[PDB]
Write a protein that binds this ligand. Structure first.
Ligand SMILES: [Mg+2]
Lengths: 147, 165, 208
RNA sequence: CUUGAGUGCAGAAGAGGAAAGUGGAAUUCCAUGUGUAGCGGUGAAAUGCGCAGAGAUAUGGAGGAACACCAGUGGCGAAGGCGACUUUCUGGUCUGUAACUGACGCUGAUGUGCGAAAGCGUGGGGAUCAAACAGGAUUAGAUACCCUGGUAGUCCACGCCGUAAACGAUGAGUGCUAAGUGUUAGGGGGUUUCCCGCCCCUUAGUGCUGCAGCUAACGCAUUAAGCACUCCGCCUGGGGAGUACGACCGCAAGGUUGAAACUCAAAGGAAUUGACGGGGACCCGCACAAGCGGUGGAGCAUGUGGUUUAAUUCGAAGCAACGCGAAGAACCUUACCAAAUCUUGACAUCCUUUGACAACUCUAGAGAUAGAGCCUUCCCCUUCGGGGGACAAAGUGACAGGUGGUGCAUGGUUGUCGUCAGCUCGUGUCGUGAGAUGUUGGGUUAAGUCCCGCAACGAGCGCAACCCUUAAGCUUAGUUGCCAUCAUUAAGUUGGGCACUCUAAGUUGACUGCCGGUGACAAACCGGAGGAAGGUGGGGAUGACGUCAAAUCAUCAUGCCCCUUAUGAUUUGGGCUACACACGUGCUACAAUGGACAAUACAAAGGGCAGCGAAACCGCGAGGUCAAGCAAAUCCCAUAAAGUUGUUCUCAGUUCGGAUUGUAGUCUGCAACUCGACUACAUGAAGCUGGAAUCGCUAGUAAUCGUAGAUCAGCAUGCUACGGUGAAUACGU
């Protein structure tokens, strides 16, 4: 019921990478995600010269919801803070899930475009943020006086 | 209990049996039963009952509780002193003594009763309900509230043979 | 499921096999050698009412022993019988043997003997109940911690089949250190067939 | 004559009644001032009101009806009923008193009268609320609930009907029989300075808990359903039916009185158990949620249904049938069909009769078979017979056989409710009894697990353990296993070694068990250390009483019933595998985490004797020659694959996919035509993530890659186990 962490990963040195690779690992091939991600942190620095943590950390702030909803009952739905665990889980979850939805042929171009556009507050990740934060915290009036 | 004594003679005698059910989901658990009377046919009788999954168990258990409850049954001249009506739970009953030589005249259960308390000639008609149990409880209710000349004239300051049935 | 026999559960721990020999992977010659032994014994069982026979089998020989309550049936008066049985056995066994009778002790508390017995009274149309109450009763005199005793089928040679049981004492079953004597039987009178399922329990003990 | 009844005299209270009079809030309608765009309504909506300025807000006006608090199991009255206040008139009740008349009393048929609300007439009034009605919405539909309006009517007066769950479903009156406890109006007395306060008593109605007792039970219990008396009314199974005829009353609707015919064997009350509840309290579960991946689309395999058939062999059918029996369908199997065939028979036992047994060729035949050669040959024991395992062809009566029906006659066997946590028995008690009691309540658990408390005490089945396997260590043993010290070597292959790994045997350990807190001190919960492993450590096996008249007569066994010159038998060929279609199970696909080529590392488990197939050689290849080692820690199966590194590919129905078809070949089996498997060439399908609905799963899991085996002349995408890589989420109920 608690979380059972993943330790670090020292390529490039941080942990959010560690939580990231596992979601890309379609069908249990951990070396492929390992490669294409690590190269993604080569190319995102290559184009638009900067640090990997600048683009990455900044984006996964930019695409990271902090308020959010949930339904219960007629159709009412509580606006709800996000735990930091789910905070990053949603950031990365919707990040890759839309990073798919770009539609390039290349392993890493899609990602560098994704988080480097997100880090410019553009891309469907940011649009997802704005939609969730639209329906949420606009209809707060009815569902807020609860847990 | 009260005070079963296994010392007199005995003649167990059976009145009925039912097949009686308790339904639990799925099946139907049922438990044969029986009533009994037990007496010496010499001045003592009482009923006894019980239930079991099988007859011999039931009747035997009934007999173990049977001896435990008794009445003295004041009898006189191979006959009851007088006539009453018993009543218990709408199983009323009516007895009367008799010119001798008749034999007990009554229904099945009550016949088994008074035939076991050694009474010879007596008249009755059961009344109210025909259910076997409260019939009997009527009988022994009356016999429990019954007296003979010695039972009474003791109480009243006078004495028998200026007064007698 | 639903339930099973304990003997295939207790085996491996607290009972050896009724049959023993060398593997070499050639079983079928030797197991179906044993199979005819397992057949012919019925023509001793019918008179003897035996519990179980072992087959130990050394290299060049055979060594068995039949568990009975009735030795006199099979030993002959002064040995008149077992030699005869060796003769009628070698004709099909096609190899030597040292058939060596064994008696089983507290002799009639056993299972297949007694199951067979109650079947026997059901063969001559004994009512079912007294058989079972007297079974458990004599069993309890002879010493035991608990017995179960069952019948199935059309009782009293009557309408659609039923089954009952009159158990007494504790019959530890789902436990694993029991050493209970389970058996089974059959009997026909007129209507279908009647089996049983005897059980006992007589104290906890290992084979070592 | 006074004790019943009534009259007094002094008192107490009250929503007791009829008529008139007065007043505040509130709803509404209108008028005016203020001011803009919504109001109002619902679960969600709509219809309606509104720019002619609503609603909201303030002022004042009219108008009808009802009277917040007070109000209470409180009061009054004969009932129905009666709640703003004041006046007029006026009925009865309770107490105390006791002079006063001195039994005047109780009940009450027929009659007479009052009588909720609705209803009716005649006339007035009309603020709300609201049948009928209209519209809207829901709904399959809704003339019903919901919503917006809305007439009669509610209201007053004079009249009329004349009923109700008009109920406490309990007639009136009198009298006697345990208490406790409040409440309402009074009365007597003690205490108090004064009781106004406190207490004790007594009357009348009023409520609750309760015995004696009654009652079928629930229940009533001085306000009796107790103990009795008087008087009245009423019932005689249920439907038919409170109907019909008739009478009577009524303006009318309809009220009262009140049957029959036919028809049923029940109608019905009280309470117990069980199930159920869109009744309630509690907890748990891949049951929801949070998450991942799939079915459903596309093509293939397999099975059921259907269709069709000489036959497409039978069973199983909601979960709890449909990759099930069938863990192997060319024949065989195979039950089904066509053809030729048989009668103690395909086959088993018995009697006779013999005899040890048989084989190879020819003929005819598809075989089955026989038609002839030929030789099976008294072998174990014989003194001429005989005995015997074992043959014999013939007679052959008993016979034999039936995949022949009933699984709703059975045994046995197995699923399912569900590893759900419960279900039952004795003794004793209560109850007329069925049944209940324990097993309930508090606390507690994954657990009817456990403590405490309790008219209950104990036992059993069940969970747990008890056993296998797994996680660590110690001892023991060292080849085929291992090579750390070293030498040597293609190589642990051999010298040497058993240190480590390992192999299988014995034992240690994990048990609330140690500490701390909490908690009825207890059970138990929470946390701390230690250890490899803490709260059943992971898992397996194990499956209560019973249920589904669940499945199986086709594994087998079997009662009954049936077949017998065939419902039995042998054989060749055939089919069980059909094909407009749907259904379910599963496979591979719809490509860049991808495809093709090359190099390259890491397993576990299991099988091999008439079977594993090493090396080398040929061949593109399946395979072939050949033969070493191998009954196995030895040797072979047997490269593990995914992966990792490289080259290329750069988004196309593509080097995507891999169906179908033709050809050329490999092995097994006699023979691969229906119907085997396999390689090589060529072909190059549908399909570019899946609709409505829907399933799986909480960590070594899903997802995902390959390996071994059984069944086996050949044949497994299925079944079983084996490991490899290996995740996200679990807010919460
Ligand atoms: Mg009073």
């Amino acid at each position: 019921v608690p979380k059972r962490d993943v330790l670090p990963d020292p390529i490039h040195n941080s942990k959010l990478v560690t939580k990231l690779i596992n979601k890309i690992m379609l069908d249990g091939k951990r070396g492929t995600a390992q490669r294409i991600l690590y190269s993604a942190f080569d190319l995102v620095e290559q184009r638009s010269g900067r640090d990997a943590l600048e683009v990455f950390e900044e984006a996964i702030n930019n695409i990271m919801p902090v308020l959010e909803v949930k339904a219960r009952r007629s159709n009412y739905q509580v606006p709800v803070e996000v735990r930091p665990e789910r905070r990053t889980t949603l950031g990365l979850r919707w990040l890759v899930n839309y990073a798919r939805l770009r539609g390039e042929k290349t392993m890493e171009d899609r990602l560098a475009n994704e988080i480097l556009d997100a880090a410019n507050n553009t891309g469907g990740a940011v649009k997802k943020r704005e939609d969730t934060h639209k329906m949420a915290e606009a209809n707060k009036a009815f569902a807020h006086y609860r847990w | 209990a009260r005070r079963e004594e296994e010392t007199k003679e005995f003649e167990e005698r059976v009145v009925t049996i039912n097949r009686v059910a308790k339904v639990v989901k799925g099946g139907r658990r049922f438990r044969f039963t029986a009533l009994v009377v037990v007496g010496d046919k010499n001045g003592r009788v009482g009923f006894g009952t019980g239930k079991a999954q099988e007859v011999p168990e039931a009747i035997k258990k009934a007999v173990e509780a049977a001896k435990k409850d008794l009445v003295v049954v004041p009898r006189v001249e191979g006959t009851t002193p007088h006539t009453i009506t018993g009543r218990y739970g709408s199983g009323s009953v009516f007895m009367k003594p008799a010119a001798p030589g008749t034999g007990v005249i009554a229904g099945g259960p009550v016949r088994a009763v008074l035939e076991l308390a050694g009474i010879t000639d007596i008249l009755s008609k059961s009344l109210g309900s025909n259910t076997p149990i409260n019939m009997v409880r009527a009988t022994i209710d009356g016999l429990q509230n019954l007296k003979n000349a010695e039972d009474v004239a003791k109480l009243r300051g006078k004495t028998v043979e200026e007064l007698y049935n | 499921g639903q339930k099973i026999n304990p003997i295939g559960l207790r085996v491996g721990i607290i009972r050896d096999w009724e049959a023993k020999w060398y593997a070499e992977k050639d079983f079928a010659s030797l197991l179906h050698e044993d199979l005819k032994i397992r057949k012919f014994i019925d023509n001793e069982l019918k008179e003897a009412s035996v519990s179980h026979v072992e087959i130990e089998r050394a290299a060049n020989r055979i060594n068995i022993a039949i568990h009975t309550g009735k030795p006199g049936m099979v030993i002959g008066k002064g040995g008149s019988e077992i030699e005869k049985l060796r003769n009628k056995l070698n004709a099909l066994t096609d190899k030597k043997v040292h058939i060596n009778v064994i008696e089983i002790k507290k002799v009639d508390l056993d299972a297949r003997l007694v199951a067979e017995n109650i079947a026997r009274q059901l063969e001559n149309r004994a009512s079912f109940r007294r058989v079972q109450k007297q079974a458990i009763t004599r069993a309890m005199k002879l010493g035991a911690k608990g017995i179960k005793t069952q019948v199935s089928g059309r009782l009293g040679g009557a309408d659609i089949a039923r089954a009952e049981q009159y158990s007494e004492g504790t019959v530890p079953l789902h436990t694993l250190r029991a050493d209970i004597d389970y058996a089974h039987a059959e009997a026909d009178t007129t209507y279908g067939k009647l089996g049983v399922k005897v059980w006992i329990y007589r104290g906890e003990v290992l084979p070592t």
